[PDB]
Ligand binder design. Structure first.
Ligand code: HEM
Ligand code: PQS
Ligand code: CL
Length: 393
């Protein structure tokens, strides 16, 4: 009943420009079968949203990558939050929700905004910069490791580890296997920083360990929960900030609207998350035979969701391929949906907002002035290089 397609959503051709193939996947039907990897695929908003919001049928404890943890061993010990289902997911999720809570954002907002303003001031002195290395990468590295409580030495492992984590959700292709081959020093660094004595007082890591007193998590659970904040959040936020700068460079009318009302900075970043979804794909595993979109999927089957495709589905969005900083973005799935919806979303929005605010107030024009290079990852979408000239306001 369901169409079989040979599209490889983990190929370099797909990474380079996924949007035509995503229309083909959406228009083939609500549920497709991807013969290249023997998985089901859903690329329309409706089915992506339905899958994310039924965690009992479409579980996460068998992995959110291609690998089925019932059949293969995970490349690293499973995440206590991402790779767990309710009820095991519930208490670790609550701890991270309180560590990264609305109240916590007040304690870090002033410092995050100051670092964003300072970075833009510094970049304006150079004029011609790389908006990835010098901005989208440099800014999160200047605020988040400190907010975690990490020491200075060894931070060069953070970007490789994040890219490794998201490559490892993919199939065993060259991108994944080469990342795992070089992973040992990054794993060793990350696992060591998760121990309580290595996390500075007042930071996110120390706060996680402090929750072991409440009954929500035990002391032996805290290192892995800290590991979550050294796995997720870096590359996605980098890619989101880079995408926002890319969009403001490509859509100068939107930069002009943002300059005229810098309070649109938060929604300008949210629209960038919808428009160039930093996380493009990941999986669920069926725990039973299930009818989805008129299709019957058997038990123990991997289901690949196309988050970026759902965020550009014309069945759900008006003018989905336009970047609109006043768009009503509520409902996009760039942060997921349901019980696993990004627990770090307040940190990401804070970083994105204060950076776009600094650009809105200090920059008059953003002009691409060099070759734009794409960064390739099995599940992340982002730029490798974005040469731009910043004109001061
Ligand atoms: C633009 C930036 C970000 C994007 C696009 C993003 C995307 C996502 C998505 C789609 C999920 C759902 C995964 C699933 O349903 O299986 C998720 C979960 C998660 N995110 Fe993010 N994220 C971002 C920033 C962050 C930050 C800054 C942090 C940490 C400070 C973080 C930590 C996490 C964690 C721990 C989870 C697992 C939540 C759970 O399983 O309950 N993320 N993220
Ligand atoms: O708990 C962790 O280590 C972890 C949590 C979440 C992610 C993630 C996965 C897919 C999309 C967005 N985020 C990765 C790792
Ligand atoms: Cl690890």
């Amino acid at each position: 009943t369901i169409p079989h397609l040979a599209i490889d959503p983990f190929s370099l051709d797909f990474f380079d420009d996924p949007y035509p193939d995503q229309q083909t996947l959406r228009d083939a039907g609500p549920v497709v079968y991807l013969d290249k990897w023997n998985v089901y695929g859903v690329a329309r908003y409706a089915e992506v949203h339905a899958v994310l919001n039924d965690p009992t049928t479409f579980c996460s404890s068998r992995g959110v990558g291609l690998s089925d943890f019932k059949k293969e061993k995970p490349w690293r010990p499973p995440s206590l939050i991402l790779e767990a289902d309710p009820p095991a997911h519930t208490r670790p999720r609550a701890v991270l929700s309180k560590v990264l809570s609305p109240a916590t954002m007040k304690t870090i907002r002033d410092g995050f905004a100051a670092a964003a303003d300072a970075k833009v001031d510094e970049l304006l002195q150079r004029g011609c910069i790389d908006a990835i290395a010098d901005l989208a990468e440099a800014y999160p590295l200047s605020v988040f490791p400190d907010a975690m409580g990490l020491k200075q030495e060894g931070r060069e492992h953070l970007l490789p580890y994040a890219g490794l984590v998201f490559n490892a959700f993919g199939p065993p292709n060259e991108l994944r296997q080469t990342a795992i081959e070089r992973s040992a020093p990054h794993q060793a660094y990350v696992n060591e920083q998760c121990q309580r004595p290595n996390l500075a007082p007042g930071g996110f890591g120390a706060c996680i360990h402090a929750f072991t007193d409440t009954g929500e998590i035990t002391p032996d659970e805290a290192p892995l929960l800290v590991r979550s904040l050294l796995s997720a959040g870096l590359d996605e936020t980098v890619n989101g900030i880079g995408a926002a700068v890319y969009c403001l460079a490509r859509f100068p009318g939107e930069l002009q609207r943002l300059r005229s009302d810098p309070t649109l900075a938060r929604n300008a970043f949210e629209e960038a998350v919808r428009f160039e979804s930093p996380v493009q794909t990941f999986f669920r595993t069926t725990t039973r035979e299930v009818e989805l979109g008129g299709a019957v999927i058997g038990e123990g089957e991997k289901v690949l969701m196309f988050l970026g495709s759902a965020n550009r589905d014309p069945r759900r969005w008006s003018d989905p391929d336009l970047y609109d900083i006043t768009r009503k973005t509520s409902g996009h799935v760039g942060f997921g949906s349901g019980v696993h919806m990004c627990v770090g979303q307040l940190v990401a929005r804070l970083e994105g907002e204060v950076m776009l605010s600094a650009l809105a107030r200090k920059v008059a024009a953003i002009d691409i002035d060099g070759p734009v290079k794409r960064r390739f990852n099995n599940t992340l979408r982002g730029l490798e290089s974005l040469p731009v000239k910043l004109t001061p306001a």
